[PDB]
Amino acid sequence: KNIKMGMIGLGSIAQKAYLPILTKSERFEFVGAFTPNKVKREKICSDYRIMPFDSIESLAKKCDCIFLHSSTETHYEIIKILLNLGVHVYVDKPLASTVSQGEELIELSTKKNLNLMVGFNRRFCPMYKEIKNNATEIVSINICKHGLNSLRNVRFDSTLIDDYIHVIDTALWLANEDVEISGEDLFLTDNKNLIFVSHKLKGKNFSINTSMHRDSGTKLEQVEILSKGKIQRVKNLNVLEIEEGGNLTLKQSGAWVNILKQKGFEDISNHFIDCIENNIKPAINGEECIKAQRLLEKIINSVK
Amino acid sequence: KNIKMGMIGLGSIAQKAYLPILTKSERFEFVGAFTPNKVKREKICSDYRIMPFDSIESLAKKCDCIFLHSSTETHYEIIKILLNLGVHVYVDKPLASTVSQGEELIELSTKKNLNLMVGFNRRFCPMYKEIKNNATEIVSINICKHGLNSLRNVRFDSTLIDDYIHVIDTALWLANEDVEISGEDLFLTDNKNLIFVSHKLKGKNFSINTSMHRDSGTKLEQVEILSKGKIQRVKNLNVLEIEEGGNLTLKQSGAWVNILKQKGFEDISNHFIDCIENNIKPAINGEECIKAQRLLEKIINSV
Amino acid sequence: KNIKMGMIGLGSIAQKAYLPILTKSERFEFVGAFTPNKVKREKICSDYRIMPFDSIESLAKKCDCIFLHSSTETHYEIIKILLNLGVHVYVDKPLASTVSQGEELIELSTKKNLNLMVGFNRRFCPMYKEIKNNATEIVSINICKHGLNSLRNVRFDSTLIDDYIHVIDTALWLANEDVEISGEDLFLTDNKNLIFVSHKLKGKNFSINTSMHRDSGTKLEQVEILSKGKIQRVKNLNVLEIEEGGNLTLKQSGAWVNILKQKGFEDISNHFIDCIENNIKPAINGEECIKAQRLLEKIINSV
Amino acid sequence: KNIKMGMIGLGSIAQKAYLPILTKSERFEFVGAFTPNKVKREKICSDYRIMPFDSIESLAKKCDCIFLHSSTETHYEIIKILLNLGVHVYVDKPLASTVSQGEELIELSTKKNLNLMVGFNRRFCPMYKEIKNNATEIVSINICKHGLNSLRNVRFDSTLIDDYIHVIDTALWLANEDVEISGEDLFLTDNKNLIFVSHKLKGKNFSINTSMHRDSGTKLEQVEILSKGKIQRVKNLNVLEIEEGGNLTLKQSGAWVNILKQKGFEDISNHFIDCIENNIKPAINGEECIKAQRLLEKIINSV
Numbered sequence A: 001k002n003i004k005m006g007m008i009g010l011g012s013i014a015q016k017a018y019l020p021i022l023t024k025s026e027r028f029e030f031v032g033a034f035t036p037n038k039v040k041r042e043k044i045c046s047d048y049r050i051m052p053f054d055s056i057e058s059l060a061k062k063c064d065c066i067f068l069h070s071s072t073e074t075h076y077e078i079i080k081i082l083l084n085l086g087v088h089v090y091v092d093k094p095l096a097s098t099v100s101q102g103e104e105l106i107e108l109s110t111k112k113n114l115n116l117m118v119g120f121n122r123r124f125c126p127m128y129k130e131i132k133n134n135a136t137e138i139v140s141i142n143i144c145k146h147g148l149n150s151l152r153n154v155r156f157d158s159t160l161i162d163d164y165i166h167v168i169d170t171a172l173w174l175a176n177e178d179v180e181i182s183g184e185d186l187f188l189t190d191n192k193n194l195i196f197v198s199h200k201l202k203g204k205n206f207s208i209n210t211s212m213h214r215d216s217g218t219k220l221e222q223v224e225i226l227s228k229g230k231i232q233r234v235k236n237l238n239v240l241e242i243e244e245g246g247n248l249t250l251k252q253s254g255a256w257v258n259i260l261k262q263k264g265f266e267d268i269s270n271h272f273i274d275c276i277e278n279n280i281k282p283a284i285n286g287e288e289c290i291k292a293q294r295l296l297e298k299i300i301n302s303v304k
Numbered sequence B, C, D: 001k002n003i004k005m006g007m008i009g010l011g012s013i014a015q016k017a018y019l020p021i022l023t024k025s026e027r028f029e030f031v032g033a034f035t036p037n038k039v040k041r042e043k044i045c046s047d048y049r050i051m052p053f054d055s056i057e058s059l060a061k062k063c064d065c066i067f068l069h070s071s072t073e074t075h076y077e078i079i080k081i082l083l084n085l086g087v088h089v090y091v092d093k094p095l096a097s098t099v100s101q102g103e104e105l106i107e108l109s110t111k112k113n114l115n116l117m118v119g120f121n122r123r124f125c126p127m128y129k130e131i132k133n134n135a136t137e138i139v140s141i142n143i144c145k146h147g148l149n150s151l152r153n154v155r156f157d158s159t160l161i162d163d164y165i166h167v168i169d170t171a172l173w174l175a176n177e178d179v180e181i182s183g184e185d186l187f188l189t190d191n192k193n194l195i196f197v198s199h200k201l202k203g204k205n206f207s208i209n210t211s212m213h214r215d216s217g218t219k220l221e222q223v224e225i226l227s228k229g230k231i232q233r234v235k236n237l238n239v240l241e242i243e244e245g246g247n248l249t250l251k252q253s254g255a256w257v258n259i260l261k262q263k264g265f266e267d268i269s270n271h272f273i274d275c276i277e278n279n280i281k282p283a284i285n286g287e288e289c290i291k292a293q294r295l296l297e298k299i300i301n302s303v
Ligand SMILES: [Cl-]
Pocket: A010, A011, A035, A036, A037, A040
């Protein structure tokens, strides 16, 4: 086929969120894959009948684009190599360890006329798109993402950039207007691990209330939009509730809608490829790749 | 019995929230009732076999205490008459139209050694008390009270002290620590009617996010408490949800639990009577009667 | 007032399901009440400012109608006394200990030109009426009534005619067509206490599956109607669910709808009085009073 | 690897329910696939980097086992060919168009020492297994499978064998004791298409109520087990509800549990392979492959 794709990084995220969709290779040729651990590389590639490659460079030279699912700290150096070898790059969030590094990569991509897209899957979550499209005259939005036994020994800034970024990015995508921080809770363990974080993001027309508790009673995600005559909620990316006219209407995801379709991974990955096919840029480009991260760096830097 | 009770105001609130409880008069004598419309007064009194009285003063002279369910604007003048006649008073929120008037009434009640209690029923809502009792190491609380087609043709300030006051009072009762306003949204119609209001009330240990949308998709009230290892929610004062260990547990109010018991009206009314019997003040006394309203006046003054 | 009403039997059901309605005596004069236990009689009457009476007969002579809430075995001779004294009678289910005794009472009421009504409140449950009214082209109905720790040390037949009768009556009311019983499950303890009962009631156009588990994991009731393009459910008489077009829509009872209104007690009691006022027979009259009981007698006799 | 697997039939079921799991070929070599339409064959094989084969026979000769996802009417002829070529066979339900044919195929598999397994995935549904394993002293089971706009332009017997068979198979698996039909509803269109079917299956200890409405308000599947002190329900194979001690606990499938794991397809497919690896017959073999179909044939013949 026209488009040749490779994958770099065959870790748990690649295995559960990307491989299951991309290995049904309908709109591209799956040229090969690389991961540093040779044993794991050969086993995964064998399972899917994909050609294993011995390096980032050898794979990139045979591809038009790469799905990169490596650790955040390796993004900057790997993406610089890939862009210089002329391949489009899809990478999991965040783009790079710092926004400054991200800005450098963005400029390199535009110089090379290549798409550098960050995997904010929630922007492609079908039910999130539905409530966004159907909301008019919004008065408030609430977004939360809580975890069960999710309290670990990593500094809070890592957790913010790695996970809270999804909450902030979804907020900014829904706001579709400039916002300012008007409230913050940030609770840390004695050893500086994240317990709870919350913000109020104020826009001209409404505010967004974002919240993440790492030591909650369940793993939950919810977006709730309050608008004229209506409440819309999407729970765990896959149940849609609408309160209107004094009734609560509940819609489930279809019985045969796979979980990657539900969460937006299917559509975001296919969109990345489609944009290459049609010589256009995905909406997640440029400042869109780093605006949530920029806000988080400001929050992180305000911590005395 | 030892305690003689009378009721002033026999309108919708009295009929739905108080009379269904107080007319089964187990702990007091229901001496009589008054409301200005004579036909309505005699009809409601006849319905319940209660003696109708022709004035506030005539009724008060025969009672030890009065349940007052009149319009907010009439609270100040009526309560002054009642306290000066030596009767304890229970009144629906808010105490009076202004905090100043409330302060005056509180002072008068202290001078006369009488109980003046404001009807913040949510502090006696059984499920609210349950979640408050069982939460430890709280990180956040969210409280909302939304309405369907509930835009009112009155200035926003009236709607805040009449209705949002429940949200604010419940927040302060749950906080059990000082709080500061750290965020606000106040959206009004062109005629200055309330559409939406929200605040963040920040305490040292956690914050409370409050909200009220008057033009929502349903009538709903919810308190949600996020604490270490747990989420607790009470919906419409009568369904309790707990999320713990990755599962959700749902408890309904018992099949024969009456709605006034569910909402706290039964317990708050009984508590008022019990405090008279025991010669003590209810917890909703003094500054507790007006602390939520004080916060609302700061909001109103800022517009 | 034109209509004089009295109440006989002031037990737990009278206290929770009838007195809270009837003591707001809008459409009738509450003349008095009698119950065999004098101490209880006087306490309850004092609480509601009702006149206590010394006997069934002394009360009946001062009334046009009586709400009777006595034990099933006492219904027959009491009702005979009341109808012979010219009083309309509302009674809790079942009418009498046996269907042939009920048939006699019905004929006596006819001879005396009086109404004799049995308290099948579910026929007046607002949400049950709503789903009945909106269902067309029904293919199946499921009705269940389960209890938590509801095993009682009484013979199964008593539980069937005192509680399962509500399930059967609701089924027959929803069927509105002849049905034939089949597919019986009847599980009893060694001591012959009811554990579980179920039936399939087959009509020409659809069947109704009825069940009742007395040692379940919760107290619940549900009516579910499957029809063309639709599922309707009412849970615990107060939540209405509709599945149509691939969506579930849930409607709760209004925030101020009292539980007796929810369950049909309010409307059934008011219906009894209205029918007296307008000189007509209530919905539940004649064979409607005993049709469910007749089916249960056939069931009990087949064991 | 040791086990060589091929797939015959690359239609909608293969694509949604099998290929997504089997193409991650961890425990076998995916040797190739065949489907009659060459264009579709080459597209799907290209998508997954699998070798396309031009016939059933050429593929079978290179495999140890075959997953067969062809139309019911072709099962008998294809399965005879495969068993005679020495390949183990996994096929979607039902085994063949008739029980006579199925019995022949089973006997043929025994003669050739090969496994012939029918794809009753619900027996491997994790939540179904959980409730089955946790139920004791069952008093009743209800199973339904309803559809939205699911009326099919085929005779009812086809729909019973193709779809209601899941309901009946799950019932017999949960019963684990002999049952007798104690009730039946069967409603058809003028052209003899299935609208609604229901049965009561009576066992010594409890009954199972099965139903399927093809013109309902939503697509729904539910298994509910009533037992001593407990109600357990599994909805759409992926939400578990337990009612116990008067409260309802709800457990969702894990956020990263894929839908084929949820529905039992993953586990049934892996079990088929594991049994080949261990020289054992899988759970669903012999009479288990046709037990549900046998009951349906009796139902169909009784019409
Ligand atoms: Cl690796």
